[PDB]
Amino acid sequence: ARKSLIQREKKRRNLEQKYHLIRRSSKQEIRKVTSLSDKWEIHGKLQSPPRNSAPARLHRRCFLTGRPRANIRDFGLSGHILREMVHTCLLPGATRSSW
Amino acid sequence: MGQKINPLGFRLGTTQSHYSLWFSQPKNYAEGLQEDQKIRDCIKNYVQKNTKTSSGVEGIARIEIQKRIDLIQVIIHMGFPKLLIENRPQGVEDLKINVQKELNCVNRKLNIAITRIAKPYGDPNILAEFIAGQLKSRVSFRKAMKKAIELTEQADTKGIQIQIAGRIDGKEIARIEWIREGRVPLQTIRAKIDYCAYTVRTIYGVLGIKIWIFMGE
Amino acid sequence: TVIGTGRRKCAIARVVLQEGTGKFIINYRDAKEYLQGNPLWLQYVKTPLATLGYETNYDVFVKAHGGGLSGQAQAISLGVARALLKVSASHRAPLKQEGLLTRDSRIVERKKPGLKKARKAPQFSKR
Amino acid sequence: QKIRIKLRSYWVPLIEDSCKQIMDAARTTNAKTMGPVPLPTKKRIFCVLKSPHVHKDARFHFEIRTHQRLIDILYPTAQTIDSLMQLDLPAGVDVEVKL
Amino acid sequence: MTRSLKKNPFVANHLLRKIEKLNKKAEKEIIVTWSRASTIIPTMIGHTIAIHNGREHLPIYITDRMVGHKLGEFAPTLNFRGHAKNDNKSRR
Amino acid sequence: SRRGTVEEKTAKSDPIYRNRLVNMLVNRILKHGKKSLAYQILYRAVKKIQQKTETNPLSVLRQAIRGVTPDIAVKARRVGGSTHQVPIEIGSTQGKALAIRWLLGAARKRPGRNMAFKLSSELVDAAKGSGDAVRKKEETHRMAEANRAFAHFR
RNA sequence: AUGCAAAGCGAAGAACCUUACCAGGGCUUGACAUGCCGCGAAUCCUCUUGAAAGAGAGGGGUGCCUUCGGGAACGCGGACACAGGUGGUGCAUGGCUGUCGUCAGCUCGUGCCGUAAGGUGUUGGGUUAAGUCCCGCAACGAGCGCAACCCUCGUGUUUAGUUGCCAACGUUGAGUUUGGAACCCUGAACAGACUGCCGGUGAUAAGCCGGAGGAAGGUGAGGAUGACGUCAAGUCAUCAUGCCCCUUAUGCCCUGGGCGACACACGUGCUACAAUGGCCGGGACAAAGGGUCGCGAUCCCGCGAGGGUGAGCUAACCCCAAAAACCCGUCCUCAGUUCGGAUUGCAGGCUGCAACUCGCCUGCAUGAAGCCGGAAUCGCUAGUAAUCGCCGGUCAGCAAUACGGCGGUGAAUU
């Protein structure tokens, strides 16, 4: 929700299109279990570069405020503000439901 | 607090349409809300510097955004089109590039047209910026609320209701003010009542106005 | 040939009556083959034919889809009862007396939020 | 039969009037068209909490009705391509052209 | 006891490199470590590895009976019943 | 009573023998919504009873439950401050319903073999005078007629 | 957050991250915003030390315009305003919520009553879910609420038929093909219950009790919708904002730890004490939804989780599932058990830098507590209780035990 916390996660999004764009397929060939008995340790051992880099370290956050919890993949917003948008008229096909 | 249902949220299925009516695939749907909310925050305020200038003086009524592929409609309903368009063709020119610099990726050819309203005392969005604008200049509150009731009744309406929350005239304890005239059917769907919500600045606290204008049945 | 719909819960079963021997064929299988392992609710399928006396004269073909085994069995019973109205309009009075023309409007619907099993309210701590 | 078009939107009186226009303007060109046959709607139902704190009850419901309908043209003629490509009338509908 | 082991046991680069530099002619036992997600490799025999738990570094001995362990299960996370120094009691 | 009048709630009758009052015995022995196996508890107790008795299975069912059917039971009503143990006379609609509740419990509170023998044993034990089923008819008569003075005669 | 309106409650998902907390190692106009100046394009591959944050240097490389003075995009460093705060106060507040309540009341205009504050109408007699309605009555009318209008479900009808269906007719039996739109389904519209009709009760009213006709009646079932207001009840850790305070700092970065620590207590759930049950084999039907850094069949391999190869579906054409009770036969046959699975050892799979603390799942073995449970106490009247499966959201992963959503079977009593 803070401009210091959203920024810390925006720096985790910038290296996703640098390290995980092309050189991720370089380690994805040997981290998995191959059908053959010869599985190399050399690349799984020297796997030191992804310190701050990880695809699982990414949290979606709200696009208006920025809180880590209750994020829906379709909208991208959190349950408090996602509500304020549909209670007005800011999203098409977000009417009242029965069942 | 313990109020009734939102008349803009209850009447979403029929009569009153959305402020944004489009379609997108669930892959690029999240980017569709981000691009439509960033421009709605830049057109309602519309100030590059740290001043209290444009958009809030003319009064914005409704912002309808319609898109298919690479083109947005962004048609803004204004009360006075003298401030947004010209003083000599420079006003709409800096608004055409401001929305273009934010939204890129694909060739986003944005066309912005302008339409007028019959009378500014019929729509709820001008009333939320007019009565809340009287709180900024520190005028008598209960006299400004009773004037907002009559100014809409003379503009041919069947009912009107206005109410704020706490922190009136610099009081320590939070109270509530309510004045109503005519009939405002809060429950029914065949009433087509429009809503708006606006916030005030104030050095002592913060206020929040709610507008309820009943048109036809 | 005479048509007849007949519904129960979410089970639809189109009944088409014709004159013949008397073998009941449900979804390309026999009446004793589809509803196997001697279910008691198989007797309710043959009840609208029992009160009028048409089982030994009329043959039937029916396609059942949806619902349960007990839900499909009451869908045939209403389907034949509505189909025994088109062959003769005089066979309405002794058949409507039992309540076979009438549809059972009972449905196991939606589970309401805040509660577990629709009506079942969550128990709080006592004093 | 050959060219298949998919019309997807949210509100029903908008698509039924737009798909009816691709029937009246497609029959006067050359070949016959198969009428507007609607396929089942994919209706979603999900809940979210209203109050920003401890109030697990009073949870709402949001509906996103994706009304889909199909219409097929038999033979793709030169005068049918000059009509459908220029007739860009959708205000909130999306047309997907498949072969 | 069986954890998340496939083929790669996962031993940190700052763990083995500092031990292979000490396995030249065998010298020095005391070594500081922060990573507790690392696995014990058979060349750690005789070397006293001081592992972090949040509070301080605890000097633990490594033998031949401890191969498939993580060094983190050796260092206590919190204070329960086990081996610890008797703290000076103040006022009740 | 005046506002909203409901007579009774009834389902489909007895399988092939045709009876609506005997269909309440299959509905009370009903465990968690299994009417398919509840049929195998009543109809197998009808198949195994014909060797123990002579006459029809509908007759021995009615001639035995008359010794389990009560005439008067106690209800808790308060008036003036003290809780009175006033006995109200039970009719034929509630009396036939109370007879199958104590024959249900007596069958389950006897862990011998299967429920096909447990229900068949308590069916003939009501005719001679044995079991927990017939004991509850004489036990409710100990609570009643002893507090006869709290209720006046018709 | 904590009487009810706290207690799988906010976090629909905490191994790193998230996190805000602790310890340690570091930076300060400073991670992030604008403005001024200098060197400069910006970047890629970088090598060394170190836990990392970082710091020292290496080459490779330098687009677009101008009277080339200069600039935009961006970077390091420097100066100053500031930037920054999930720091305190929601008894300073906006917005939003629970709660009594879906209870049904809360008010007004005119006219009367009383000196007046106020009252009358919103009382009374009956009647309904309901100041709902009828009658009486200085009350006469009206407004908000109730109802209805909106969304699904239950009947039919009209229109249109693919990835749907398919009676009649030619069948590679698999709608499979031509073909047919009848039926099912599907998607928009239309018709219909309005006590309306008959009778009885009742004050020849209302309304209630039954009946007729009907798929459906007496607000059809069930949602949404919950007034004036009560608790200065909850939230300034969503956001916003007043005030106050910190501002080489309760600001910022990183590594490891913590939140899923314990002698205990309480709440809410799940799995059992069986045999209307368990187990083995065979075997009949569902609805509703999900999915392109995805759903993933077929085949091969492994006891298994799963892995290799890889088609199709961007989707009622493909996949996620082969739904479970139930059912036939057989076995057991009530001994803490061919009930129950807690716990434990050993050996693996999978997701991710990475999972010892902290994971899910598989395989093998071990296999207790427990025989329905005190005082006290909870929910539910129909397709509800009870019970049996499945799907979704969150999400790399914490798949039937949390929440949300779907259907199968199907009562009791008033």
What ranges do the domains of chain F cover? 1-154
Question: What's the CA gap between E54 and F125, in Å, rounded?
Answer: 74
Torsion of the alpha carbons at B7, B12, B16 and B18, rounded to the nearest 10: 120
Q: Which chain A positions have a beta carbon within 8 Å of E6's beta carbon?
A: 33
Place of tokens 């082991």: E5
Phi, psi of D15 (to 5 degrees): -75, -35
Pairwise CA distance, residues B134 & A88, whole Å: 25
Tally of domains within chain E: 1
Q: How many other β-carbons are positioned within 10 Å of the β-carbon of residue B26?
A: 11
At C55, the amino acid letter reads E
Query: Which of C113-121's residues contact partners 24+ apart within 8 Å by CB, and which partners?
Result: C113/D47, C113/D59, C113/D61, C114/D56, C114/D57, C114/D58, C114/D59
Q: Is residue B8 part of a domain?
A: no
- Give the distance from residue B89's alpha carbon to the nearest chain A alpha carbon, in angstroms: 31
Provide the domain limits for residue E36: 7-84
Does B23 lie in the same domain as B98? yes
Is the domain of B150 the same as that of B75? Answer: no
Structure tokens at C34: 């589809």
Whether E63 is covered by a domain: the verdict is yes
Instruction: Determine the Cα–Cα distance for residues D7 and C1; give it in Å rounded to an integer.
Output: 40
Among B187, B33, B196, CA closest to B129: B196
SS3 B210: strand
Could you say which residues 26-85 of protein chain D have a Cβ atom less than 7 A away from any atom in strand G? 34-61, 65, 67-70, 72
| Cα-based angle F66, F69, F75 (whole degrees, multiple of 5) | 165
The answer to whether B84 touches B114, Cβ cutoff 8 Å, is yes
The domain that contains B179 carries what CATH number? 3.30.1140.32
Helix (H) or strand (E) holding F120: helix F115-128
* Partner-chain contact C40 F12, CB within 8 Å: no
Strand partners, B194: B213
Give D62's DSSP letter.
E
The technique is: cryo-EM
In a domain, E77, yes or no: yes
Q: Distance, in angstroms, between A44 CA and closest chain E CA? A: 7
Q: How far apart are CA B94 and CA F66, in angstroms?
A: 98
* Same-domain pairing of B32 and B92: yes
β C7-8/C11-19 pair status: antiparallel
Structure tokens at B21: 């009516």
Encoded tokens for A47: 């796997």
Report the 3 state secondary structure along C97-113: CCCCCCCCCCCCCCCCC
Single residue among B118, B148, B174 that ends a domain in this structure: B118
Residues B114 and B126 in one domain: no
Range of the domain at B153: 119-215
Q: Residue with CA nearest G243 C1'? A: B204
CB-based contact C55:C19 (threshold 8 Å): no
- C24-26 and C58-65 beta bridge pairing: parallel
Dist CA E50 CA E72 (whole Å): 11
State the Cα–Cα distance between residues F133 and F45, nearest whole angstrom.
16
**Are D47 and C113 an interchain contact pair (Cβ–Cβ within 8 Å)?**
yes
CB-based contacts of F111: which residues, under 8 Å, 6+ apart? Answer: none
**CA A60 to CA F110: how far, in whole Å?**
62
End-to-end CA gap in chain D: 9
- Shared-domain flag, residues B111 and B124: no
> In angstroms, rounded to a whole number, what is the distance separating the alpha carbons of residues F124 and B64?
82
How far apart are the two ends of chain B, measured CA to CA in Å? 28
| B21 and B107 inside one domain | yes
Cβ atoms of A60 and A76 closer than 8 Å: yes
Residue A47 backbone dihedrals phi, psi, to 5 degrees: -90, 60
Alpha-carbon distance B66 to D24, whole Å?
A: 26
Please check whether residue C58 is in contact with residue C20, taking contact to mean a CB–CB distance below 8 angstroms: yes
In a domain, B192, yes or no: yes
B96 and B108 co-located in one domain: yes
Task: Compute the nearest-CA separation of D93 from chain B (Å).
Answer: 6
Residue with tokens 């009834």: F10
Yes or no, beta carbons of E8 and A46 under 8 Å apart: no
Place of tokens 């209290």: B52
User: What is the three-class DSSP state of D35?
Assistant: strand
Resolution of the solved structure (Å)? 9.4
Question: Residue C61 in contact with residue C16, Cβ under 8 Å?
Answer: yes
| CA pseudo-torsion sign B25, B26, B32, B37 | positive
Residue E90 placed within a domain:
no
CATH classification for the domain delimited by F1-154, as one of 3.40.1500.10, 1.10.455.10, 3.40.50.2300, 3.90.1150.10 = 1.10.455.10
Give the CA-to-C1' distance from E74 to G350 in angstroms: 26
Among B101, B118, B135, the domain boundary falls at B118
Let me know whether B177 and B128 are in one domain. Answer: yes
Does the CB of C1 sit below 7 A from strand G?
A: yes
- Please tell me the distance from the alpha carbon of residue E33 to that of residue E75, in angstroms, as a whole number: 12
Q: What share of chain E is helix, strand, coil (3-state, %, to 5)?
A: 10, 10, 80
Is B24 part of a structural domain of the chain? yes
Q: Confirm or reject contact between D57 and chain C (CB < 8 A).
A: yes
CA E33, CA E14: separation in Å to the nearest integer?
A: 9
Whole-angstrom Cα Rg for chain B: 19
Query: Quick check: is E80 in a domain?
Result: yes
Chain-chain contact of A76 with B30 (C-beta, under 8 angstroms)? yes
Q: Are F151 and F87 in contact (CB under 8 A)?
A: yes
Q: C90: which strand partners? A: none
Q: Say how many residues make up chain D.
A: 99
CATH (domain of E50):
3.30.860.10
